[PDB]
Design a protein around this ligand. Structure first.
Ligand SMILES: [Cl-]
Ligand SMILES: [Cl-]
Ligand SMILES: [Cl-]
Ligand SMILES: [Cl-]
Ligand SMILES: [Rb+]
Ligand SMILES: [Rb+]
Ligand SMILES: [Rb+]
Ligand SMILES: [Rb+]
Ligand SMILES: [Rb+]
Length: 164
């Protein structure tokens, strides 16, 4: 396991624009294009992201290209975020993947708002953090994915992803 394989399990791979679990236009491996309800707005975002006239369809190589950009940018953003950087640096490499996963799904601002859970993680109070993380819109709306991420935080193992 690693962050790419983890997020590939959680996000899937689709080569045509589709709506994510929130109803938002997405493509590839969880690449959010826009929150606009306009498919045309989403198609414009896509073409700009890829650098060609895609009309809503990409290749697997292109999907992987956006995915590595998105993972790299999630890590870089965490390290530039005053709330998330200390927690990231305090965590072992497996638990860091859980944090990257959350940022990938909900964005930096959203994760940075989990003040109490972040403190528990920094304190290495793993079972307490796991309890707290579940008390969230996040968990309610995507409970099975959140369970996997939370198990990763609680245990520092890949048990919730082996073999998905
Ligand atoms: Cl982009
Ligand atoms: Cl604990
Ligand atoms: Cl709690
Ligand atoms: Cl889910
Ligand atoms: Rb997805
Ligand atoms: Rb629409
Ligand atoms: Rb670390
Ligand atoms: Rb994403
Ligand atoms: Rb907060």
């Amino acid at each position: 396991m690693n962050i790419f394989e983890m997020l590939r399990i959680d996000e899937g791979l689709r080569l045509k624009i589709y709506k994510d679990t929130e109803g938002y236009y997405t493509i590839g491996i969880g690449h959010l294009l826009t929150k606009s309800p306009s498919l045309n707005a989403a198609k414009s975002e896509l073409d700009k992201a890829i650098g060609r006239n895609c009309n809503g369809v990409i290749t697997k190589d292109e999907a992987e290209k956006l995915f590595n950009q998105d993972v790299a940018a999630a890590v870089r953003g965490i390290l530039r975020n005053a709330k998330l950087k200390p927690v990231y640096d305090s965590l072992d490499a497996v638990r860091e993947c859980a944090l990257i996963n959350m940022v990938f799904q909900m964005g930096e601002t959203g994760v940075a708002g989990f003040t109490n859970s972040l403190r528990m993680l920094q304190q290495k109070r793993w079972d307490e953090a796991a309890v707290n993380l579940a008390k969230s819109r996040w968990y309610n709306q995507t409970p099975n994915r959140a369970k996997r991420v939370i198990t990763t935080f609680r245990t520092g193992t890949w048990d919730a992803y082996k073999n998905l």
